[PDB]
Design a protein around this nucleic acid. Structure first.
Lengths: 75, 158, 217, 182, 290
RNA sequence: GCCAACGACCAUACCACGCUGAAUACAUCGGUUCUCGUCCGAUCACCGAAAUUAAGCAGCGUCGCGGGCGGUUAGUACUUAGAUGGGGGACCGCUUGGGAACACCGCGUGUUGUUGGCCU
RNA sequence: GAGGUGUCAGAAAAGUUACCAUAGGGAUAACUGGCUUGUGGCGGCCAAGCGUUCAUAGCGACGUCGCUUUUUGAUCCUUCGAUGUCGGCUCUUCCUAUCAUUGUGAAGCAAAAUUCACCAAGCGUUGGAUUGUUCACCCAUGCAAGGGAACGUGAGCUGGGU
RNA sequence: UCUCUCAAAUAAUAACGGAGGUGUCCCAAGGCCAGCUCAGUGCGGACAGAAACCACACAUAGAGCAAAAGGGCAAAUGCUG
RNA sequence: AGCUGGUUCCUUCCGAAGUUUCCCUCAGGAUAGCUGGUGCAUUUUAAUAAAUAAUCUUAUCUGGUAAAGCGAAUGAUUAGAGGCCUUAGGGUCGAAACGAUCUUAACCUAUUCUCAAACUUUAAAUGGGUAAGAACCUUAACUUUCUUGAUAUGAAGAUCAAGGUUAUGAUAUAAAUGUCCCAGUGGGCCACUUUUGGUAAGCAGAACUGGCGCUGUGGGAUGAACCAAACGUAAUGUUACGUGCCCAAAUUAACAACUCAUGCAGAUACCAUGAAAGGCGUUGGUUGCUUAAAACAGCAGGACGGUGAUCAUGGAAGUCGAAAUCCGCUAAGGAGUGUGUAACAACUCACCUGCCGAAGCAACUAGCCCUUAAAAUGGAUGGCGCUUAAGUUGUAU
């Protein structure tokens, strides 16, 4: 009683009716498969940042007193 | 009933084409892959670890993970029927930077030059790309002699 | 004995070679594709006259046999055996398949109805294109009509309208009837077996020295 | 084949350091069975050079030659420098300095086959039973390193390259050997 | 053989045709962790050439490998070693040359002064606590022979003792008794200071004096006998620390001709005319022959 | 220019046959205490004293062998789209777009990154 | 973690029903019709040969193109809340691809006779033995005992085969 | 369940379509490294012939990697320690 | 009872699917997809863009089909020619020869013939991914018990400052989003194109797309599906398909050909059939001829001799057949195109002439017609009928 196995007939009509629908360029950035560590010190990054105009100004004042780093980039 | 395994029809997908034969030469790694860069996935079948499953060959994604010896590329792949997003961990031996992105970047720098040049010329900018319009009042001078010659044909000959 | 060739007249299917997958194919009924004084230097028989197919159809090995046999007999009988090179430029490397209706002894049980209808190999066919040359026949300029008459009678043995074209080409060599005279009345062509060797320039000095000396000697 | 060649006005073009040293003389005793006969065959090589012979296993089961795979059919020793010269000369006498023009390969190397190894020294010692010897002498050019070497592997030569003629000339010179055509 | 074979021959890379690089060792050595993005990995590459010991620190880039420091044993007559620039001793010195010259341009001189007393003891240089961690350099032997007692490794011991953090198990340094392991530390020292070179002198100076007349001359001509070799190599180690000479060239420079020398490639006008002249001569030979 | 080391791209770098290679040099190429590895100090380990650019390697030549690229071949082949176009059908003209391949011909026969040296 | 259900996303399971029963099914066989036409039957094309000679009077290889749908398969569209199997009896009309008869053209047709082909179905194409038999096989006569279509024809029979 | 093809060059893609295989095999045929160079051919080597072992030259994968088939590989993924 | 049958008023608006997966599943469900409804959040995609969604284009990737190839790997294969080599196996001249010379074979070389779905270096078209900016780019600097490094770099989070025009094109019927876990569907059918099995089928099965299913109307005479077109109700206007009449409509106030059909002359895609092969019917083409020293048809007239030259003798002087095949005489006549006496012989045609004194002859191409082409209740371009068409081709209103 040979039925019929497999037609992809009307599937592509079906899809465009209520759009196959692309999601989002999330400014609010999704994660998974980031090697756990980055995530740990990403958490710390956010926390330690506490806010900020004085914090940046004090460490700029450290960099001018120290100057600092001719060695790091070459190594 | 059907096809189904993973390597179905990949005789020519994973074929190293004549005179490109062997060990994947080191430049491939030397390219620094950075999160958010557009990457094209090209199946290299000599590097058998981190193989991009056959639907993903010439389907191109943006990088959302860099892991110790894999680059996790989000390819958006058309399902029947709701575009689900897949993070595929694939190696750099199969992952080549798309210079689709560079065309954009080249444009920013060029647009800024044209903007500056025009502003210093006072007026006018018009930096947006217009496709090839039906052109111009064309004068042909003989020079080098009038035209004419018509054509053809005796095209018999079996 | 093998249906009749309407069933295989048309190029319907993905061409089946005599392959390591087809193993079992009956021997092509065509053995000898070249009958003639094949051993004659190209300068002796300056004509070529062709039967060229004007149809996308398949000519059977069976048909090909008959057309060869016709061409041999007319040329040999009227105008003496060794005055012609008959080359049949169509080899039959495509396999005809027939699914015989195996019910034997009206006894059925397992038959095979359409289920599975796998064609077993029965026959060989040459696949033919518009302006594909069937026949090429070499002769000396006084034997034009006799060649043509032999070709006319070969046509009928084959399905679907073929026409005779007298090529402005010197024999089986590419060279239009001016061109081998330009070359062989200089120093430039030297003899190969039903063919001619080049006229090279490539390559280079060492080869050129010898060629020029051989003609002059 | 087609050159602006010259042979430029340098002066004479002799034959300097590349002169012809002997790579190895390798002796083999080929005995169709392993066991005791193979061990006895080993005694013949081992005493002659003093250097212990290494064995190599049967590639395959030929069966027509009644051998099975990895049977350890036969033993061989390679001999280089000083001891190579002495042993080669000794077996040369046994062969007669009359070789053949073929014995010679295009890599300019030459072989003998001899029966009675006892002719070159070795006491009859009847428990060991008389074994024939295969001689293959590979002639090289001093500093053969290039085509052998693991790092910086290069493919030999124009001139260098040992030919049949080069090897026959060397044979004709020292040993005064008659090339002798059958 | 045959026109035909040449066509389908997919002949090896370029350096596999020169047999210098197998490329398989090269994959493993270069191939960075991708999650270390733009970091220049640090390879110490040792090749033993039969009168240079050339040790270079190299990294890969997409344009080509970039070398930061290069030391040649032909630098060692500055530091007083005129002779045996093929040596074990000269390897340990060339390894110290790279190591120290690496620490000189890259400012790591005061910290990580590497094994100063050179007692040949099995030390990889320990990271200094609350200091940023010292240069991790990886051995590219390439196809260079993974051989116990090699100068390849004699260079590596000297590079470690030059302050560099080169991970190595101790087996491939010279003097290691295989049955058991069992690191003979005296033997290790002796290779550094060319004592073995000196032993080669001392024993045969009584007996077979053919070998002096040949090998280990220049040691006659400079009055440096056997016991004196030990001091030159110990005081070469001190002299290398003191000074990084760097080497400067003032030349200018002729790409063109001088003298012969690249035989200016025969214009198409020249080739064709010459080719015709050959065919012309061949016709002339046949006319004489007749 | 050359040479070295380290390389990228990956046969313009190969192959074949000659010729040539000065200098800092690779190489050719020697010695065998020691370490070390080999049946064999051929390789491999070490010592670097005597020779040599013939070879490797490099360059130079070659109407070569091969390899690249463009045209030519060819808008053809082939094909998307169209007709109440043709043909008995097999298939085929036209019309709107896109567009090969072998072949033949020409021209090239490694280029270049870092770092050091040599410079005819 | 393992032990397993292969109907392998996982029932625990033997026959027979012509003594049968039900709910359905033309999603499905048998059967009419339709498509197809390999297979069957009929007719050509070319023509190597047969035929004293002479390819085609009559024939015709190897090949090749059809037509018919009356062979048999292939199919399942229609029909399973039923379309009355096969033959034989009886009775109908037509069709030719014409065996006889008419009028004709061929002949290796001398006569006689038969064969081939044509216009032609107007008109014949039978009586029996056996078989249920179409078919078949035989006997006898007559110049001649051509072949098909409406699976004709079971509120016509018979119910013999199935 | 899987390979190649059908499958109309992304992918998806069926018929009792075509050529086949799977229920196991293996402490290496896993894992890693070092060394090596194979299919095949040419040329030498008593016993050795076409094929035995020995020796050199060539050789893009034509071999070998349990198995089906198709991919992949040459100082290996193969082979040998 | 998963089965069959039936299910009771209307209108309005929107409006399917026969597919996916799993299931003793396959006459059925669940499930996903398609469907409606209920709404919700925001409209520079909103009420008096520098934010997109998704289609072209552009830019940037992929691919092994069509084609091509085999003197490219793999897999098949044909032809000669030329050859080393003792690799020859025979022979001839040789006692024999790795002697000379033929002969034939493996290889080897350059050509050459022909092919692949389960071959492919090569390699399309048409396809399929991503991008075309304020959610962007660039400058500058903060966290890093990490990853990581002699870098509190990089990598992210990210703070701060710089920027002419927002950085292809049309559009948005507003779009996105959630709930119902909603029905209905899980039996498809047909056509262009592409295709597999099968000779094929109104056959079994895919790929893409549209219909039909759920779709009348106009048109194809007719008709589920083809064409044109998607239908609230009407007037008036104009189209597709047609236009002798039937049947709305020019037997055109246009036009040039072709065709005359005794048994489906012919008469609109799908389509209701027609070939292979023939035709001095007719019609237009192509190419080659004879020839003014008179040709081409057609008569008249020679068609012999060297010589039954001769072999087949069964009989052949020219002629069942043939090696062959040249002179002579010549204006020209084949050691012969046939008729055939079994032979001789008598006839024929070539060849050249008298007349013909200027036309014609052969081989091809393809239209319509004719032949091929015959079947069955009476019969079908749908009908009448149509023949300088109302046919067939092309063309104009």
């Amino acid at each position: 009683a040979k039925s019929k196995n497999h037609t992809n007939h009307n599937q592509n009509k079906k899809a465009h009716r209520n759009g196959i629908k692309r999601p989002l360029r999330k400014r609010h950035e999704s994660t998974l498969g980031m090697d756990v560590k980055f995530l740990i010190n990403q958490r710390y990054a956010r926390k330690g940042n506490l806010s900020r105009e004085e914090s940046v100004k004090r460490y700029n004042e450290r960099i001018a007193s120290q100057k600092g780093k001719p060695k790091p980039v070459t190594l | 009933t059907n096809s189904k395994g993973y390597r179905r029809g990949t005789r020519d997908m994973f074929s190293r084409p004549f005179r490109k034969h062997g060990v994947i030469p080191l430049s491939t790694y030397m390219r620094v892959f950075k999160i958010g860069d557009i990457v094209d996935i090209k199946g290299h079948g000599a590097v058998q670890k981190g193989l991009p499953y056959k639907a993903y060959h010439g389907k191109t994604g943006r990088i959302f993970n860099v892991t110790q010896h894999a680059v996790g590329v989000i390819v958006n792949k058309r399902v029947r029927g709701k575009i689900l997003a897949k993070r595929v961990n694939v190696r750099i031996e199969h992952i080549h930077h798309s210079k689709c992105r560079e065309d954009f970047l080249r444009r920013v720098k060029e647009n800024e030059r044209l903007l500056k040049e025009a502003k210093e010329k006072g007026q006018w900018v018009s930096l947006k790309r217009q496709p090839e319009q039906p052109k111009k009042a064309h004068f042909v001078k003989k020079l080098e002699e009038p035209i004419a010659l018509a054509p053809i044909p005796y095209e018999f000959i079996a | 004995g093998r249906r009749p060739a309407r069933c295989y007249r048309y190029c319907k299917n993905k061409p089946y070679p005599k392959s390591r997958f087809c193993r079992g194919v009956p021997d092509p009924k065509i053995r000898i594709f070249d009958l003639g004084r094949k051993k004659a230097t190209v300068e002796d028989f300056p004509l070529c006259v062709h039967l060229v197919s004007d149809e996308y159809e398949q000519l059977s090995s069976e048909a090909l046999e008959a057309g060869r046999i016709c061409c041999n007999k007319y040329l040999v009988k009227y105008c003496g055996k060794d005055q012609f090179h008959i080359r049949m430029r169509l080899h039959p490397f495509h396999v005809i398949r027939i699914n015989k209706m195996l019910s034997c002894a009206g006894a059925d049980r397992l038959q095979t109805g359409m289920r599975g209808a796998f064609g077993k190999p029965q026959g060989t066919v040459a696949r033919v294109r518009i302006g594909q040359p069937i026949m090429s026949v070499r002769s000396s300029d006084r034997y034009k009509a006799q060649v043509i008459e032999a070709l006319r009678r070969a046509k009928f043995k084959f399905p679907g309208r073929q026409k005779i074209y007298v090529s402005k080409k010197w024999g089986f060599t590419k060279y239009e009837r001016e061109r081998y005279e330009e070359l062989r009345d200089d120093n430039r062509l030297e003899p190969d077996g039903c063919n001619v060797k080049y006229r090279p320039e490539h390559g280079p000095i060492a080869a050129w020295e010898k060629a020029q000396r051989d003609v002059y000697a | 084949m087609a050159a602006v060649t010259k042979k430029i006005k340098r002066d004479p073009a002799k034959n300097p350091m590349r002169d012809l040293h002997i790579r190895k003389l390798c002796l083999n005793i080929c005995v169709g069975e392993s066991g005791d006969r193979l061990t006895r065959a080993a005694k013949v090589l081992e005493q002659l050079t003093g250097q212990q012979p290494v064995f190599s296993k049967a590639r395959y089961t030929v069966r027509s030659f009644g051998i099975r795979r990895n049977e350890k059919i036969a033993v061989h020793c390679t001999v280089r420098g000083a001891k190579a010269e002495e042993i080669l000369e000794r077996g040369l006498k046994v062969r007669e300095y009359e070789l053949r023009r073929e014995n010679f390969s295009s890599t300019g190397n030459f072989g003998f086959g001899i029966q009675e190894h006892i002719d070159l020294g070795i006491k009859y010692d009847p428990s060991i039973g008389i074994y024939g010897l295969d001689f293959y002498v590979v002639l090289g050019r001093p500093g053969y390193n290039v085509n052998h070497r693991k790092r910086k592997s290069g493919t030999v030569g124009f001139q260098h390259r040992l030919t049949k003629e080069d090897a026959m000339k060397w044979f004709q010179q020292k040993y005064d050997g008659i090339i002798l055509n059958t | 053989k045959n026109k035909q074979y040449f066509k389908r021959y997919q002949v090896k890379f370029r350096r596999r045709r020169e047999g210098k690089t197998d490329y398989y060792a090269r994959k493993r050595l270069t191939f960075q962790d991708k999650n270390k993005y733009n970091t220049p990995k640090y390879r110490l590459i040792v090749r033993l050439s039969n009168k240079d010991i050339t040790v270079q620190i190299a990294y890969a880039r997409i344009e080509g490998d970039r070398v930061v420091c290069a030391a040649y044993s032909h630098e060692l007559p500055k530091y007083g070693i005129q002779v045996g620039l093929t040596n074990y001793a000269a390897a340990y010195c060339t390894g110290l040359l790279v190591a120290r010259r690496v620490l000189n341009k890259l400012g790591l001189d005061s910290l990580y002064a590497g094994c100063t007393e050179v007692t040949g003891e099995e030390f990889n240089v320990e990271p200094v606590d609350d200091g940023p961690g010292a240069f991790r350099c990886f051995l590219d032997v390439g196809l260079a022979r993974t051989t116990t007692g090699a100068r390849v490794f004699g260079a590596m011991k000297g590079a470690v003792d030059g302050g560099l953090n080169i991970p190595h198990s101790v087996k491939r340094f010279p003097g290691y008794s295989a049955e058991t392991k069992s690191f003979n530390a005296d033997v290790h020292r002796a290779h550094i200071f060319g004592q073995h070179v000196a032993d080669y002198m001392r024993s045969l100076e009584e007996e077979d004096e053919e070998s002096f007349k040949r090998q280990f001359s220049r040691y006659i001509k400079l009055g440096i006998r056997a016991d004196d070799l030990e001091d030159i190599y110990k005081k070469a180690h001190q002299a290398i620390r003191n000074d990084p000479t760097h080497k400067v060239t003032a030349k200018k420079s002729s790409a063109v001709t001088k003298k012969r020398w690249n035989a200016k490639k025969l214009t198409n006008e020249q080739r064709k005319t010459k080719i015709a002249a050959h065919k012309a001569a061949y016709v002339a030979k046949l006319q004489s022959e007749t």
